[PDB]
Amino acid sequence: KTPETVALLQNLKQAERKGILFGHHDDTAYGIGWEGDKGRSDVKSVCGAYPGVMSFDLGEIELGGTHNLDKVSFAHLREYIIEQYARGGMISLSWHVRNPKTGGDSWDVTDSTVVASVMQGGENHVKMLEWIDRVADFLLSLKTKEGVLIPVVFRPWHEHTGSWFWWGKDLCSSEQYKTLWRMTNDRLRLKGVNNVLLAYSPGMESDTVEEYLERYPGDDIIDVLGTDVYQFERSQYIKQLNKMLTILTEAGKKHDKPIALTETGLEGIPDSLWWTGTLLPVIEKYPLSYVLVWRNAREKSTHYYAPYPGQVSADDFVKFSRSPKILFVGDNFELYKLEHHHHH
Ligand SMILES: [K+]
């Protein structure tokens, strides 16, 4: 891993001391009522600072086209990534990859033999490695104008304990799933992709650490232990989020990995006090390195997870943002600076 990448990991590992970076998907790409405006951010428009983490998706890079599945160009993603690094924030990338057997999208679960087909000897193995190489080439293009590779937390194969993606629980064995991870790591390493940290991120199906780790590909592959948990009903969310963050904290101590709430949110945040009244009291109890809420879909204006100006939860988001526990660009962290000393 590059020096800046090791520094990022070491700074994620001191979350207990520094606080929780706040994140938003596609934050500088678009939001409610806009797309592509230079420097614009629904998060910054509400609270005045950029989120400490921004994530974007590489889905459809494997098809060799110019835009991802959410119609954002890869050349724009690279710009947004360079700009987030320049201001000192973190970047994460997910990968809603197409179905290599059916030609469908990530959510095509018609065929439960897709992962088998990309194993060694399978009809789609070479193509799967070509697809991963296309991700590798994009990652290698994430450079500062001075030529420094930009560290990224790459989070492929997510939500694998559910069965809504073609790599999900009912669609492959535990060993097949771990092999996806090994193929991914192998190709990234061969390509010299030394600017990636890998994050593991199943949802809330697991009730225990044993279950959470059943499909874990190993400490030598994974750098960040995450989970994706959304609010559908408040009491259940509080129970299930506490349950998963307890699992993450226990597992992260057992395996010496930082932890993160890699996706969460309340769609349309109709609860005007969601941020301080529901989310913060849960997450502040756990040593999270970051918490990321999902995109503000310009193309479906009910589908948003961060506020925007005038949105009913916006004032409360401002109050949340002022918590010393929650970190935005401008706050007291330096992700890419090594402080050169062991933990004790
Ligand atoms: K803050």
Numbering used by the authors: 30 to 373
Pull text from the paper.
A putative β-mannan PUL was previously identified in B. ovatus ATCC 8483 (bacova_02087–02097) and shown to be transcriptionally up-regulated when galactomannan or glucomannan was included in the culture medium. This PUL contains the genes bacova_02092 and bacova_02093, which encode the putative GH26 β-mannanases BoMan26A and BoMan26B, respectively. Clan GH-A enzymes share a (β/α)8-barrel fold, a conserved retaining catalytic mechanism, and essential catalytic residues (nucleophile and acid/base). β-Mannanases generally have an active site cleft with a varied number of sugar-binding subsites (−2, −1, +1, +2, etc.), with the reducing sugar being located in the + subsites and the target mannosidic bond connecting the sugars in subsites −1 and +1. BoMan26A has M2 as a clear main product when hydrolyzing all tested mannan substrates. Galactomanno-oligosaccharides are further processed in the periplasm, degalactosylated by BoGal36A and subsequently hydrolyzed into mannobiose units by the β-mannanase BoMan26A.
A 3D structure of BoMan26A was obtained using molecular replacement with the structure of GH26 mannanase C from Cellvibrio japonicus (CjMan26C), the closest homologue with a solved structure. The protein displays the expected β8α8-barrel structure, which is conserved in all GH26 enzymes, with the active site located in a cleft. The catalytic residues Glu-188 (acid/base) and Glu-292 (nucleophile) are located at the ends of β-strands 4 and 7, respectively, and are conserved within GH26 (40) and other clan GH-A families. Comparing the structure of BoMan26A with that of CjMan26C with G1M4 shows that the −2 to +1 subsites are largely conserved, with residues His-125, His-187, Trp-193, Tyr-259, and Trp-323 being conserved throughout GH26 (28). Beyond subsite +2, the active site cleft becomes more open in BoMan26A, lacking several residues equivalent to those in CjMan26C. Because of crystal packing, the fused His tag of one monomer is situated in the active site cleft of the adjacent monomer, potentially aiding the formation of the crystals. Based on substrate binding in CjMan26C, loop 2 appears to close off the area beyond the −2 subsite in BoMan26A, despite 18O labeling showing that BoMan26A is capable of accommodating a mannosyl in the −3 subsite. The low B-factor of loop 2 indicates low flexibility in the crystal structure; however, a stabilizing factor may be that Asp-99 in loop 2 hydrogen bonds to His-373, the last residue in the His tag of the neighboring molecule in the crystal. Thus, loop displacement to generate a −3 subsite cannot be ruled out in solution, especially because the equivalent loop is shorter in other endo-acting β-mannanases, giving a more open active site cleft. Taken together, the more open +3 subsite and the potential loops 2 and 8 conformational changes allowing a −3 subsite may explain the endo-activity we observed for BoMan26A but was not observed for CjMan26C.
